[PDB]
Design a protein around this ligand. Sequence first.
Ligand SMILES: C[C@@H](C(=O)Nc1ccc(Cl)cc1)[C@H]1[C@@H]2C[C@@H](n3cnc4cc(F)c(F)cc43)C[C@@H]21
Length: 370
Amino acid sequence: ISKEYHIDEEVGFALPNPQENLPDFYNDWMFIAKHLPDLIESGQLRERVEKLNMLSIDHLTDHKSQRLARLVLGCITMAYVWGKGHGDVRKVLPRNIAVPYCQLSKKLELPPILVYADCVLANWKKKDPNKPLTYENMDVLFSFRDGDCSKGFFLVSLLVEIAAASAIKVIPTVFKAMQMQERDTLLKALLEIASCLEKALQVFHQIHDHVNPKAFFSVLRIYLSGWKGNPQLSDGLVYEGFWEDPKEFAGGSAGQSSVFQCFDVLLGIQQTAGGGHAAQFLQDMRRYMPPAHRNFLCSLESNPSVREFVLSKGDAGLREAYDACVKALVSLRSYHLQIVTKYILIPASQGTDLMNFLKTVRSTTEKSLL
Ligand SMILES: C[C@@H](C(=O)Nc1ccc(Cl)cc1)[C@H]1[C@@H]2C[C@@H](n3cnc4cc(F)c(F)cc43)C[C@@H]21
C-alpha cells in the first residue's frame, strides 16, 4: 500500500472526489471560469480579468480547495492570454490575477500555468454518487469554448488514469516480492500489472466516440498550448507584480501524466537516459506534476531495478511475465501514436514535434523486450 504520495487506490493519480466550489469569498474567480465559453466569445473575458481585485490565497485551507483554485485560475490564464485563439495574444498577465495564481502555484509546488494535473486530475465529478465511474455518469467541471470536445478529451484521459489505478496498487506488492525472494508472488503480480494495462488500452478506445479531429486541433489544442519556445510569446509571459522578466513555461501534454512515466520507470525502461529530446522532456515534465507524484516516481527509481531482477534469475517464466507488461506499453504507445495522426497530422494538413517525440518513447519500449 502506497504512503503519503496522494495516490488513490480507486482513481490513482487523479484527485479523489474533487471540490466543485470555493468559499463564497471567491465568487469573482468562480464566476469568470464557470461561464468561459461566453466571455471569450463576447470579448469581455479579458476585460473582466482586468477589472478584478487582488484577492488573498490564505482562505484556501484544505488541499482540494487549492487545486480547484489552481484549476479556475489556470483556465482564465489560458483564456486571457489566447483570447478567442486566433492571434491576439496578451503577453502580459494582470496583477490582480497574476500574483494570486503565482502564490498558489508556489504553494502546491506547481508552475503558474495550466497543467495535466489541473484539467484532468482535479476536473471532474460524478453525476450520481451511487452509480459507478463511467463516461455516461461523469462530467467535467470547466471548459473553454462551445463544442471543443473538452469534456471528451479530459474525461477519456481521466478514464484511463482510473484503469491504471488497479495497476499502481500492485507496485508495493512487486517491490516486497523482490525483497522477500518470493517468485510466484512476483510472477502473478507482474501478470496482474500487465493485465490491468491491457484493460487500460480498451479505455483508450473511447476517445473516438467523444472527440472530433478538427474540433480538437483548432479549438482545444490552441488553449492548451503554452509559452515555452512558442513563437507567439518569444520570451514567455510576464506575471505583472511577481516577476520583472518574462518567464517561459511549457504548456500541457501527455508527458505530465504520471502514469506515463510510472511504468516506464518500474519496468526498468531507461526512458530518461541519454541526452535525447524525449529523455529530457520526460525529466522536465516531472516539475509539472504534483509534489507527491514527483517523489513517488522518485521512490521507484530509488527502489531496486525490477528488470535486472528478472534478467538475473535466468527464469524464462519471469522473463515472459515481465515482457507482457512491456508489450502492454507498446500496445498503448502504438495506439497513442495512431490517435495523434487522425487528430493532429491530418487536421494540420487541412504538428510533428509531438510525433517524433512519441515515436522515440515507443521505440525505447520495444528495445526493452527480452
Ligand atoms: C487522451 C490522450 C491525451 O493526450 N490526453 C491529454 C493531453 C493533454 C492534456 Cl493537458 C490533458 C490530457 C492520452 C491519455 C492516456 C495516456 N497515457 C497514460 N499512460 C500511458 C502509457 C503509455 F504507454 C501510452 F502510450 C500512453 C499513456 C496520456 C494521454
